[PDB]
């Protein structure tokens with residue numbers, strides 16, 4: 414590419430992101446005073462473990478559905494082969510959601526927007542995965558310290574998704590080229606906005622892997638405790654991405670095909 418082409422890529426990525434925001438940033442900020450009461454927190458803590466897992470997996474799956482749309486609108490992604498589209502989304506969809514979630518995190522009081530209000534990590538105690546929860550809160554806290562603009566989130570999440578090192582890619586060089594173009598776009602935009610200082614403060618790629626690994630591991634524990642709950646009440650797309658062996662569901666293929 415060249416300079417105007419790189420700047421065009423920047424604009425295209427930012428537009429794809431804006432169109433596939435689940436929630437506009439301003440909607441999340443306007444809600445920060447709306448905080449769960451102590452009685453409401455208690456109510457969440459008294460929910461059964463399987464009911465809380467089901468609700469959280471539903472919310473995560475809704476978020477992932479917007480990430481799938483983001484990928485479908487992202488320059489170059491639909492030009493990859495379908496094997497590689499699926500490899501990239503299966504490895505990266507959760508990672509993208511985890512980065513996007515920092516927009517819903519309020520570092521002032523350490524709360525996150527959940528089911529219409531802001532609550533702290535004690536809200537999630539019924540899940541019984543306190544280590545995973547605190548890791549996600551800590552990750553969101555780290556990212557909130559950088560004060561990402563929406564444009565920076567768009568360009569950074571594009572690179573989280575377009576990762577040429579994912580095992581299983583059949584056209585690795587094509588993904589490498591797309592990743593390099595997106596890296597240029599991201600770094601060009603940071604240079605233009607005098608924001609290259611954040612490069613050194615971004616999380617290592619092993620950090621996002623660690624969160625996704627913890628999630629899959631806590632899911633395997635839960636699925637052993639409540640196998641029928643997962644079969645009967647978890648979202649099909651969630652099971653295709655995360656459970657074993659749940660990829661007998663072929664939702665992603667359908668999502669990628671239908672316009």
Ligand SMILES: CCn1c2ccc(OC3CCCCC3)cc2c2cc(C(=O)NCc3ccc(S(=O)(=O)CC)cc3)ccc21
Nearest residue numbers: 435436469470472473476513514516517525526527528549
């Ligand atoms: C870290 C605490 N936390 C969670 C902790 C665990 C958990 O699920 C566990 C592991 C995975 C599934 C089964 C059990 C699930 C959540 C969880 C879900 C939400 C949520 O969706 N809020 C609504 C919303 C809507 C849009 C945006 S957005 O910024 O516009 C785009 C992203 C953000 C937020 C918020 C916090 C959460």
